[PDB]
Design a protein around this ligand. Structure first.
Ligand SMILES: CC(C)OCCN1c2nc(N3CCOCC3)cc(=O)n2CC[C@H]1C(F)(F)F
Length: 543
């Protein structure tokens, strides 16, 4: 059945929709009517499967015939199929089948999301792969369209130690989730079962695979002791100076604790890095009443890898935000735009605790209290006689680019609660944000601005009249156009976090993807979208 040119155009309009537009009944009947003609368009499948009422068995059987005939879909479109809209096991098996096609570098960037996608999988299939229960005991307690998702994730994790590490911790944290346990116990089991299947699949494996399981256990052991240590510190009476002496005391006793000297284990935060232990003498606590701890790991090479370990806090929102920023930055760099971003690593070792890579830097606030100005600061540490305003070209260039990158990205992610506390600067010129407590348009104060600039950022570029500021403008709109090309991917990825119990998403799960989708101004053309960003910057700077 071949549609006439007038409708072919109408079909094209429909397929051009954001994966998050809800098609009308008229619109579905039309896409359904010409489903066979649409088979050509990889792009059209997703909208086709939106046209099906999966509760009608014959309609599902019918749809599934086509799936097997359709131009096969992209990787980025497959993440649409693993969301909650789709319970149909054949569909979800079709999605996994096209994710197989992706490289592990790419899987990693969506893995946080895919672990959530487990929630929509078939719990009976998962459990019957096996051959009250503390999730963290499982690895430490070893017994002496064909694939679903669980099988696939484990199969790939068995071949790739980096992937396995994240799979392991992402699932632990899903197991640890108190809310899921009370409100969806069956889901809690599904995750226990996944961990047990992972544990099981490792032990079945060859020499190298089995060692991966020892490693994962050693890490979980490591973290259990760190946690215990932190509790001891957080109960210690008296001033912070006194509470530091306890943290250092305990790290240093390897009999009791085992934390200063160990056989090389992957760092859970960045498992490419392996670590001999924590250096006791330099451990300290931040001022915060939560008492997160700064801690220098000795790496394999005798380098230092400082982290923050937070105990009593849920890092999952922050984890997500840095996972996204990381992906945004990979994408930009694929399109040859390296904005000197600081996608620092975040990893939750539980709902109650986790790690953060600690980047050597100075809060802009401190920069003010010590050197008066971002430019003065740069003239102290990165002086040049030839360079702009007394400052090394490279340093200013880095600063302009990163200023632009965050400006866009923090706008797109509606990151609020911004202060000179959260805004950090690097003697190499790198500017970056931290502490993502409020996102997607929340803020402690009312009427938050949509663009997150300030007098101090602008001044360090040399005011609105400088060559730098023009380059800033230019890098923003350019970054905005690049990120718009990936709106599909980014939107699918947030779309998989609706049940993830991320505070700012769990207010209005139903309504969060649109919050992000609106920032992209997908209604505007690229050229119009450039003038939108320039407007935005103008308003902001005028206030
Ligand atoms: C330096 C100090 C003022 O900053 C506050 C430290 N700090 C913090 N540092 C982060 N950085 C990660 C990236 O490298 C830099 C540090 C990330 C982050 O989320 N936070 C949250 C608030 C406080 C703390 F201590 F309570 F956790």
């Amino acid at each position: 059945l071949k549609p006439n040119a007038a409708t072919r155009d109408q079909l094209n309009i429909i397929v051009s929709y954001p994966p998050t537009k809800q098609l009308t009944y008229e619109e579905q009947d039309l896409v359904w009517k010409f489903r066979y003609y649409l088979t050509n368009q990889e792009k059209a499948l997703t909208k086709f499967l939106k046209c099906v009422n999966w509760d009608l068995p014959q309609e599902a059987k019918q749809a599934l015939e086509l799936l097997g005939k359709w131009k096969p879909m992209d990787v980025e479109d497959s993440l649409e199929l693993l969301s909650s809209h789709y319970t149909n096991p054949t569909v979800r098996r079709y999605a996994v089948a096209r994710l197989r096609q992706a490289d592990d570098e790419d899987l990693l960037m969506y893995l946080l999301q895919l672990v959530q996608a487990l929630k929509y999988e078939n719990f009976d299939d998962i459990k019957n792969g096996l051959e009250e229960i503390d999730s963290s005991q499982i690895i430490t307690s070893p017994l002496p369209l064909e694939q679903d998702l669980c099988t696939f994730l484990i199969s790939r994790a068995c071949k790739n130690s980096t992937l396995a590490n994240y799979l392991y911790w992402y699932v632990i944290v899903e197991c640890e989730d108190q809310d899921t346990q009370q409100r969806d116990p069956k889901t809690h089991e599904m995750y226990l079962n996944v961990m047990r299947r992972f544990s099981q699949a490792l032990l079945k494996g060859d020499k190298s695979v089995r060692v991966m399981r020892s490693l994962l256990a050693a890490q979980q052991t490591f973290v259990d002791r760190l946690v215990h240590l932190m509790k001891a510190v957080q109960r210690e009476s008296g001033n912070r100076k006194k509470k530091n002496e306890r943290l250092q005391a305990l790290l240093g006793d390897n009999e009791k604790m085992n934390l200063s000297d160990v056989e090389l284990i992957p760092l859970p935060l960045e498992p490419q890095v392996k670590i001999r232990g924590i250096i006791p003498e330099t451990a300290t606590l931040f001022k915060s009443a939560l008492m997160p701890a700064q801690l220098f790991f000795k790496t394999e090479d005798g380098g230092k890898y400082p982290v923050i370990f937070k105990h009593g806090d849920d890092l999952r929102q922050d984890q997500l935000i840095l996972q996204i920023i990381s992906l945004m930055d990979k994408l930009l760099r694929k399109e040859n735009l390296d904005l000197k971003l600081t996608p620092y690593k975040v990893l939750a070792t539980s709902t109650k605790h986790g790690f953060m890579q600690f980047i050597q830097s100075v809060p802009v606030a401190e920069v003010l209290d010590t050197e008066g100005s971002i430019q003065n600061f740069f003239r102290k540490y990165a002086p040049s006689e030839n360079g702009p305003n007394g400052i090394s070209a490279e340093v200013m260039d880095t600063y302009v680019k990163s200023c632009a990158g965050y400006c866009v990205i923090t706008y797109i992610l509606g990151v609020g609660d911004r202060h000179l506390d959260n805004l950090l600067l690097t003697k190499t010129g790198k500017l970056f944000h931290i502490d993502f407590g409020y996102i997607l348009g929340r803020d402690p104060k009312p009427l938050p601005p949509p663009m997150k600039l300030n007098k101090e950022m602008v001044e360090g570029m040399g005011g609105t009249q400088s060559e730098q500021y023009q380059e800033f403008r230019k890098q923003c709109y350019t970054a905005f156009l690049h990120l718009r090309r990936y709106s599909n991917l980014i939107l699918n990825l947030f779309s998989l976090m609706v049940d993830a119990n991320i505070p700012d998403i769990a207010l209005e799960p139903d309504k969060t993807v649109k919050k992000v989708q609106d920032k992209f101004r997908l209604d505007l053309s690229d050229e119009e979208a450039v003038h939108y960003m320039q407007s935005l910057i103008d308003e902001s700077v005028h206030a």
